[PDB]
Design a protein around this motif. Sequence first.
Motif, PDB file in Angstrom:
ATOM      1  N   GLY A  58       0.852  -1.163   0.000  1.00  0.00           N
ATOM      2  CA  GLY A  58       0.000   0.000   0.000  1.00  0.00           C
ATOM      3  C   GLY A  58       0.894   1.220   0.000  1.00  0.00           C
ATOM      4  O   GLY A  58       1.866   1.281   0.749  1.00  0.00           O
ATOM      5  N   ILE A  59       0.587   2.187  -0.850  1.00  0.00           N
ATOM      6  CA  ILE A  59       1.262   3.494  -0.835  1.00  0.00           C
ATOM      7  C   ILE A  59       1.119   4.098   0.561  1.00  0.00           C
ATOM      8  O   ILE A  59       0.049   4.012   1.137  1.00  0.00           O
ATOM      9  CB  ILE A  59       0.599   4.491  -1.803  1.00  0.00           C
ATOM     10  CG1 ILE A  59       0.708   4.019  -3.228  1.00  0.00           C
ATOM     11  CG2 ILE A  59       1.253   5.866  -1.747  1.00  0.00           C
ATOM     12  CD1 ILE A  59       0.063   5.009  -4.180  1.00  0.00           C
ATOM     13  N   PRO A  60       2.170   4.745   1.089  1.00  0.00           N
ATOM     14  CA  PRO A  60       2.086   5.374   2.420  1.00  0.00           C
ATOM     15  C   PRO A  60       0.968   6.398   2.512  1.00  0.00           C
ATOM     16  O   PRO A  60       0.733   7.146   1.569  1.00  0.00           O
ATOM     17  CB  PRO A  60       3.447   6.074   2.579  1.00  0.00           C
ATOM     18  CG  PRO A  60       4.352   5.344   1.650  1.00  0.00           C
ATOM     19  CD  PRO A  60       3.521   4.873   0.499  1.00  0.00           C
ATOM     20  N   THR A  61       0.292   6.417   3.638  1.00  0.00           N
ATOM     21  CA  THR A  61      -0.902   7.246   3.813  1.00  0.00           C
ATOM     22  C   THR A  61      -0.815   8.314   4.880  1.00  0.00           C
ATOM     23  O   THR A  61      -1.727   9.136   4.994  1.00  0.00           O
ATOM     24  CB  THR A  61      -2.097   6.362   4.162  1.00  0.00           C
ATOM     25  OG1 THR A  61      -1.779   5.603   5.330  1.00  0.00           O
ATOM     26  CG2 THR A  61      -2.375   5.402   3.071  1.00  0.00           C
ATOM     27  N   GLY A  62       0.253   8.323   5.672  1.00  0.00           N
ATOM     28  CA  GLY A  62       0.411   9.347   6.697  1.00  0.00           C
ATOM     29  C   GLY A  62       0.621  10.727   6.112  1.00  0.00           C
ATOM     30  O   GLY A  62       1.097  10.869   4.982  1.00  0.00           O
ATOM     31  N   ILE A  63       0.267  11.743   6.887  1.00  0.00           N
ATOM     32  CA  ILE A  63       0.411  13.118   6.477  1.00  0.00           C
ATOM     33  C   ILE A  63       1.887  13.461   6.351  1.00  0.00           C
ATOM     34  O   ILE A  63       2.649  13.232   7.260  1.00  0.00           O
ATOM     35  CB  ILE A  63      -0.201  14.104   7.478  1.00  0.00           C
ATOM     36  CG1 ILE A  63      -1.708  13.869   7.673  1.00  0.00           C
ATOM     37  CG2 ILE A  63       0.031  15.534   7.005  1.00  0.00           C
ATOM     38  CD1 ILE A  63      -2.527  14.073   6.410  1.00  0.00           C
TER      39      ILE A  63
ATOM     40  N   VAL B 186      -0.429  17.167   3.634  1.00  0.00           N
ATOM     41  CA  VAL B 186      -1.451  16.262   3.136  1.00  0.00           C
ATOM     42  C   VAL B 186      -0.857  14.872   3.135  1.00  0.00           C
ATOM     43  O   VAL B 186       0.369  14.694   3.281  1.00  0.00           O
ATOM     44  CB  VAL B 186      -1.920  16.649   1.719  1.00  0.00           C
ATOM     45  CG1 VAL B 186      -2.506  18.037   1.708  1.00  0.00           C
ATOM     46  CG2 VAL B 186      -0.789  16.566   0.698  1.00  0.00           C
ATOM     47  N   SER B 187      -1.711  13.878   2.927  1.00  0.00           N
ATOM     48  CA  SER B 187      -1.255  12.492   2.898  1.00  0.00           C
ATOM     49  C   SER B 187      -0.109  12.280   1.923  1.00  0.00           C
ATOM     50  O   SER B 187      -0.096  12.846   0.837  1.00  0.00           O
ATOM     51  CB  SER B 187      -2.390  11.550   2.537  1.00  0.00           C
ATOM     52  OG  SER B 187      -2.683  11.613   1.170  1.00  0.00           O
TER      53      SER B 187
END
Lengths: 188, 185
Positions: free
Chosen positions: A62-67, A73-74
């Motif tokens: 999964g592509i990283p999703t944290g800000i 932004v994500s």
Amino acid sequence: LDAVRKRPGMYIGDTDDGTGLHHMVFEVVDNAIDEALAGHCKEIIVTIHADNSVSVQDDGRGIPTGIHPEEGVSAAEVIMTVLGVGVSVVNALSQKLELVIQREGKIHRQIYEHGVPQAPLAVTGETEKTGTMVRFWPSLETFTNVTEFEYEILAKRLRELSFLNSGVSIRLRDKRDGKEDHFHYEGG
Amino acid sequence: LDAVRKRPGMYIGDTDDGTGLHHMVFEVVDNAIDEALAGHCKEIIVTIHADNSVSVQDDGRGIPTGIHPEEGVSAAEVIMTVLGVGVSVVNALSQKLELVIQREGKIHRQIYEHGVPQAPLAVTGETEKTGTMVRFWPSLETFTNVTEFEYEILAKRLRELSFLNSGVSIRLRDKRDGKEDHFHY
Ligand SMILES: COC(=O)c1ccc(O)cc1O
Ligand SMILES: COC(=O)c1ccc(O)cc1O
Ligand SMILES: Nc1nc2ccccc2[nH]1
């Protein structure tokens, strides 16, 4: 992304003869293969949908999703909106792009239109799977003349790709006529 | 301009109740008034076209057309594409924007779509006149519910501005139904 919008041809290739159109797919596939290769199972699925969109799914991390601490932004949004040519080019030249990331037990979803995010990346549910799915609808303001994906162009290239990417299962499905293929080279 | 496109409400006002929509006109008009002031005749013309677009013309000096030393494109394009909110906001939120500059004996034209120039600013002819004209078609992807310009909302504001900018003539024309006004203090 305005540099891309101003001269799309400099970034994606010929926007009139179908070459750039198919390059959109190949760029996405390149990223998906890189995701798939970082895992054990390694499968990507490339689907030509009936509504002239193409989706590419992988079962990677999964592509990283944290800000992103600087961009605010994500991380996924940064990758999609900040300038292989990069998936941000694809996003810029797509009238719509749907992003679904499964990561850390969560489903994340976001929609773009012409590269503009419609809302921030949102956790909309739970999952026991991991991976990234990108589905895009090429912008018909950019892609003229040849605007439909040719199955054979994708199959030929995906076949060639399978032999350079050992262990990666590549499935291709055309929802317009039901045609499907499976390229899986296990060498090495 | 992507920051603007991403959150248009934060730059132009409410995009659903007509607020933002009319604000688009007001931003262009502010620039136009400034241009008109620095000229001799001092007139601006605001026209509501039948196709839901608005044009604003002034008889000012014409906005600068020369290449911006640092940006590498016409100064006009810099103003239209780089972030009173600025006309770049209006450009970003317009599905189409037509720019016509009459300056130094020449007519210059450029077309934008969603803030993206279709070609570089180009000289298209000769003229004895000076001035700037901007016509914009608000993006119906951004503005919802209230999408048609209300004559009276424009009239009220232009009236207020005429008192504040005395000496500047402001004409308003609605090509939908022939209505017109002239504000001049
Ligand atoms: C950077 O990651 C991407 O862009 C991407 C990753 C995985 C995928 O299946 C499709 C993609 O476009
Ligand atoms: C930068 O100026 C502008 O955006 C502008 C727009 C309309 C006008 O009649 C005059 C102007 O100068
Ligand atoms: N239709 C359309 N085309 C666009 C180009 C850039 C940003 C937003 C857009 N909406």
